[PDB]
Amino acid sequence: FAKLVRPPVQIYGIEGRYATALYSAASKQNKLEQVEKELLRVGQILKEPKMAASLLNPYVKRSVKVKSLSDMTAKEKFSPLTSNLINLLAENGRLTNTPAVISAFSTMMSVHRGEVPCTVTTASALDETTLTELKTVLKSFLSKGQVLKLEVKIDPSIMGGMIVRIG
Amino acid sequence: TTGRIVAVIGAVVDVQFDEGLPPILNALEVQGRETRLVLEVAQHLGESTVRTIAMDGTEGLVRGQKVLDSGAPIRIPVGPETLGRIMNVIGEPIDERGPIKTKQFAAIHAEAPEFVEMSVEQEILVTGIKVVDLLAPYAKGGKIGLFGGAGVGKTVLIMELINNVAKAHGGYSVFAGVGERTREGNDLYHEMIESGVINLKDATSKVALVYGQMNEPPGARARVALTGLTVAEYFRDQEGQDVLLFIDNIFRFTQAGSEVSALLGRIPSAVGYQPTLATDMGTMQERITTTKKGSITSVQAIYVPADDLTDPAPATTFAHLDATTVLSRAIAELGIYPAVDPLDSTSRIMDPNIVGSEHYDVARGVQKILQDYKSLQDIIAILGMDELSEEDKLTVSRARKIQRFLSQPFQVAEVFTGHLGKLVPLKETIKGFQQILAGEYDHLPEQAFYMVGPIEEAVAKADKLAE
Amino acid sequence: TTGRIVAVIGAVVDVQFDEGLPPILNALEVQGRETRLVLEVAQHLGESTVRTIAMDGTEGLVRGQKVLDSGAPIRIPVGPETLGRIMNVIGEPIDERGPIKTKQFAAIHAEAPEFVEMSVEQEILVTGIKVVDLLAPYAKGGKIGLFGGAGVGKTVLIMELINNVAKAHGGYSVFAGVGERTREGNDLYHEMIESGVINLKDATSKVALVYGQMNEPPGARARVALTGLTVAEYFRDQEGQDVLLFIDNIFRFTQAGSEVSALLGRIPSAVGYQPTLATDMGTMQERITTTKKGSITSVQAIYVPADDLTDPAPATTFAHLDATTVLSRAIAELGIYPAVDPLDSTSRIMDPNIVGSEHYDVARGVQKILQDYKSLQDIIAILGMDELSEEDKLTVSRARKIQRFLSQPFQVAEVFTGHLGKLVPLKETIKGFQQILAGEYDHLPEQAFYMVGPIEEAVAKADKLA
Amino acid sequence: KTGTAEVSSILEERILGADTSVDLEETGRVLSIGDGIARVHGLRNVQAEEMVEFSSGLKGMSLNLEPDNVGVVVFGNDKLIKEGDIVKRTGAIVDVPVGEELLGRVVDALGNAIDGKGPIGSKARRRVGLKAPGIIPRISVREPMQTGIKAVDSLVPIGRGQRELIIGDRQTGKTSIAIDTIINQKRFNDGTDEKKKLYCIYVAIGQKRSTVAQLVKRLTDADAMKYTIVVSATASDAAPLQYLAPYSGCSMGEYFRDNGKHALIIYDDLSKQAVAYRQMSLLLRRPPGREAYPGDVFYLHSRLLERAAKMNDAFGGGSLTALPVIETQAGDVSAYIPTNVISITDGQIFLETELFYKGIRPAINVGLSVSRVGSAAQTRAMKQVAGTMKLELAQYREVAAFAQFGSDLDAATQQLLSRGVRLTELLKQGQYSPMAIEEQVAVIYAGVRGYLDKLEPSKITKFENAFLSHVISQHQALLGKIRTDGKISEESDAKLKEIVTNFLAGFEA
Amino acid sequence: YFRDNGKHALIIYDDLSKQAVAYRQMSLLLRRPPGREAYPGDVFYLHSRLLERAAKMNDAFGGGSLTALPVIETQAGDVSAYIPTNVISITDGQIFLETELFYKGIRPAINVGLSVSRVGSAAQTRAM
Known about the structure:
This is part of a larger assembly, with 1 copy of chain A, 2 copies of chain B and 2 copies of chain D.
Chain A: H1 19-27, H2 32-47, H3 52-55, H4 86-91, H5 98-105, H6 137-140, H7 162-166
Helix pairs in contact in A: 1-2, 1-5, 2-5
Chain B: E1 2-9, E2 12-17, E3 26-30, E4 38-46, E5 49-54, E6 66-73, E7 75-78, E8 86-87, E9 104-107, E10 124-125, H1 130-135, E11 138-139, E12 143-147, H2 154-167, E13 172-179, H3 182-195, E14 207-213, H4 218-238, E15 242-248, H5 250-263, H6 277-285, E16 289-290, E17 295-301, H7 312-320, E18 323-326, H8 329-333, H9 357-383, H10 390-406, H11 414-417, H12 426-437, H13 455-465
Parallel strand pairs in B: 8-14, 12-17, 12-18, 13-14, 13-15, 15-17
Antiparallel strand pairs in B: 1-2, 1-6, 2-5, 3-4, 3-6, 4-5, 7-9, 10-11, 16-17
Chain D: H1 11-14, E1 27-34, E2 37-42, E3 50-54, E4 59-65, E5 69-75, E6 86-93, E7 95-98, E8 105-107, E9 124-127, H2 150-155, E10 165-168, H3 174-189, E11 199-205, H4 209-222, E12 228-233, H5 239-257, E13 262-268, H6 270-283, H7 296-306, E14 319-327, H8 336-344, E15 348-351, H9 353-357, E16 364-370, H10 380-400, H11 411-427, H12 437-448, H13 458-473, H14 476-485, H15 490-507
Helix pairs in contact in D: 5-6, 7-8, 10-11, 10-12, 11-12, 13-14, 13-15
């Protein structure tokens, strides 16, 4: 057994169970950002076909997938151990899943713990702070060109039906 | 250790503790659950999660909610203080008469005695209801199964039974009303109150009551069974006694076991029954016995699933049963109280090797004859009477006398009987039946033998009816 | 190619080859498993992993371990020198008279022979068992499905047939002890030895014994069928012979299969079965043939699972049958040997041309009366027989007599019965039943009819009874 | 992706590069535990069929070595353990300690005592995994063999090696039936030689401790217990334990066999095993099949039972006579295991239980009871009376058939019924009443020679005792002889008759 | 091919019972679930459709016909059986034959009472 690091995000299983591993891995040593970043970099460095979807053939087998993606951490220069967990997604086919696993991981720094608004809100963007919708108040109360095709129009809708909804 | 609700799919609460996952069975207490939320760990599901069963009804819960493990299985009050008190499963006074002052707690699991402790040869538990004892000579520690027409004063009999032995021989009784109708436990309750067997002025009402009525989780209701066991274990070992464990219904328990299984994701075998139906049974039944310290004689009320008993479980159950109470509404209908089915309420233990050979013979002779009379009714039914021998007549009458002699007045139900019940010292009983069999009274009215207590008293009643 | 034990989950040995995969059914030899441990490639699981089945025990075996493909499926020695030697499935003594030498091999799969190759005609062979002959006489090259009994009857029956046959027919035989009860084969062995049909001074018995005992893993048992099948095809065609294929009991194979499909993590079927229950069977049965280069007549013990034939599996089985002996345990209980379901004890080629019409008609009559009677017991039971026209009562009686007369006791089980062994030439038979049908005899008791060979003896017995 | 361990601590170091590592090769950590099936991660270099040992000291068997974990069936309880737990190999498959100083001992299946005479005096261990012998090793059962239940021995003529089903419903002393059987062997064990003796292994499966307690006590009392192992996995028993017990027995009986000995294992009762095993399968999610049972329960039983045999001399001549028990539900025998067992076993003893209950002791359904085996299993002596008797009973039963009318038949048959009744009395033999054979054939002889057919049935038995006591006193001589000859002699017969007449004369008329 | 090519075709399907078995098997092997009796049910659709392909047409189609004589072989007369039930729901009759008659020697051995084509009794023959 081990220390179990459940930092906000956390995929709540669902194949960032590695992420949860790695949240405790990351957290151990706090190579948090490094690896967080490793992962970004990696992220498309992999995710493009470029040797990578070729290597994401099934048909190439971990005979040497273990010897070329893995040895793409070798092929790359990342891997402070970040390949090793690759080599696991490697069997565990999670490579195709990874962005999201990274997402969950990241989000970014304190960004690790974001938030985007909704109900009557129009607004897109994360929240890194403690108490909030101070900032959101001051986020709206920033610009005023603004959208409502970036979220809620309270307009068609909220109460646009309601009177109707009474009759 | 605290765990977090990770999943609630019904009362399967999957809890993730990032903190120790103790052994299975551990009662966990949910933090944030203002009514006692026992979770019994059911699985260590793996990856910091355990599968639990709420032993209670769920609501309000949030995924993540904090649960603090009680670090042991469910522990319950054990001790005298239960006698004349109604506890629920968790032990909590569903007497609703404030708490019960115990100190001795027990985790409700317990085990089968380990082999050496086996008092190797059981010995008759004396029912003292002549007939009862006779035809089913129970074994101290024995499992008695009760097949039976409900509420005949089923309960009356039971009450009476408790009375008859557990008073007489100072034993104790447990009634674990499992899955029962709250109403029926209620009815009973007062009925005991009424009987005085429950005394409210004494919590040494010869029965401790535990009820786990049909409204708890099946397992929970099921576990009320363990609870009762745990208590009875207290009285046997600790109180050195013959505890009587009156159980209603072991079936309902059974169903309950099976009920969780599915949900437990199990493949619960035949009839849907838990595959572990047997193990459940075994382990509990094996908990029941006669220790050297005493007896837990288990009197198990038996609901007739599918009006059948070959329903694998009862079928199995038979293995555990050793004395069978088939109650006869027919005998009742004849006004005969005892209303027992005689020739089916039997005890395996019945032997001459065992339970006296005399007793035995008398019994077998009796059974035989009772059956023989039984035959003759059929004959006579069609053939009138005294188209046949007077030996048949004699026997008929004797049988009938014996029959009547089986009828045993009843002791609190002066209200029903207009008589007072009586208890019968064994030997005179054996003797008793033999004597009638020996037809040594053949000039006394049989109606005398009706609602007789011990055979002398039957002689006494004989006299009075003989004017 | 060589494989790694990657998982042994039961005797499903999951092997990962880090080399080419050969086809499925390539036999893999567990290295370190001198005790010839064939694992049969079953699946290409993907990623050069195969699912295999061990046919021999699995213990000690670590995951990792090395298995070597023989580059082919199970190939086993084949050759006549086996005729009077017992080979296990892997074509190896269990005669234990050391090993037999054969210099011909076969992979235990033969394939369905093209249609044209068939001896497209098969013709009444006989057993001397009245009942059998009557209802279901042999043909020539046909597979008979033998249902029912233990060897209170069934197993007995087979044997008895054997008793007449290898001898009487020059019957070249294969005995396939399928999921065999070793013991009986042991007994048998000595008997065979005794009998000299297994003659050991010349391993040219009428019969090669293959025993594929229960004790083997399912996989082993499952595969012996193919094997035996292979042998007989060799023996038929190659060795020219009039093969008899004794299977006892193909059911136990079936049983092995079902378990296996399951174990293969695959869907079995309804009742636990297999989807391919049929196709393996079908294909096996289709491997079986009497081409023209001899005959494989199968005498198929088919243990009616739980004695329910309704059971789709047997239901299927029937398709492959061309003559059947369907017993009646029901009858058997009545003491009876031979005890049959008469109304499906067959040779499909039941015909007044094929069988003579005398037989035929008699048979149709018999089937009729007995059936009618069959209607009637039920009635009688729900009544008495009294109401029921006395003539019928007569026929009923006769029917029992016919029954009793069908009852045929055997030599080998004079031993058991305390009652003489019998075999009956057909004509005397036709006559027999025909006479009872003529009902003149009627006056004479059932028990006269019971357990006889010719009715004549029964006539004798009747008098003697009187 | 989703197997598991992807959010364990498994991955959690494998991330980092597997960091710090030990076994998972020879020990494993309980990946998950539930159902007494410890999915144990690791153990990876484990055998096949390894018995493992738990951190809680409990046993398990590594049945399923899956590519990721070992599904280890636990011979125990996980209320006594928890997750991640170290499973340490024993390195070894299942063997059981085996030893004959277990004769005079009651053990649990693990081979540990439950006799509480401390440790086993066993020093050997022996595979429970042991193989069934070969064809040739086995050799035919020329032996007779007894139960002391005359009726049984007679009509079921028995040999040593033999697989024979004890079949009937409900404790009739179902177990009693077995008990007497055992008791009789005592004299043989008080007799001589390994083959003129049988070592009893009473594998008690699912049989609640209470059952045992008495029972063992009985054995104690008889102290035939001395040549007896009782392998007991009672009702309580963890299913693999319950399951295991026969296999355990399987090692032990073959042992004896292999120590030349003629052993008797009473597999008591496979019904309970089967249930468990099926259950076990199912708990593994491994299927059922027909009747909820997965089909290699047949294999089970084969596997188990094939190991019971009568060997030739090269093979120590050995025997393990297997007396399996199945208790029927109601003669429900398409009931897979009955089906199985019938075909496996080399006859079966059907009891018509009602009769028992009607009082018949013995209560056999003889008609169904069978030894196809038959003749090899019997003495000429017996053959002479019994041979005939069975047959005669065949008629008695046959004529018991047509009891609608009654004995208003011909005398023979009227007699057959009467005689039959008589024979019944003779075949009724009290429980706890095993006899030696010569007396038995003797006692049968009279009645079968029709002598007792004067008597009213009750006096047959009465006679029999009385007669017994008579010969016991006097003609003890003759018993000596009969025992000697293994046949009944003309003389002996004549004398017997004569005895009989005297006895009879002594008896009343 | 014939039918529509005016001709009158006869197909004897001997036997769909076996067909279903195969198909189902095939399905199951696809892991694609069964249905009743382990049979998935669109073997009905399959067959129904198959049998829907049998027809008697008009003249534009050459009067075209394909007459279908499916055979389903009962197992212990188990009409109940899925496929039999199926077919029953599809059919334009069924001819039940009973063995018993066959055994009587009664050959044809028909179970006439059950044997039916209602529809057939206008596609017949004045003579008859």
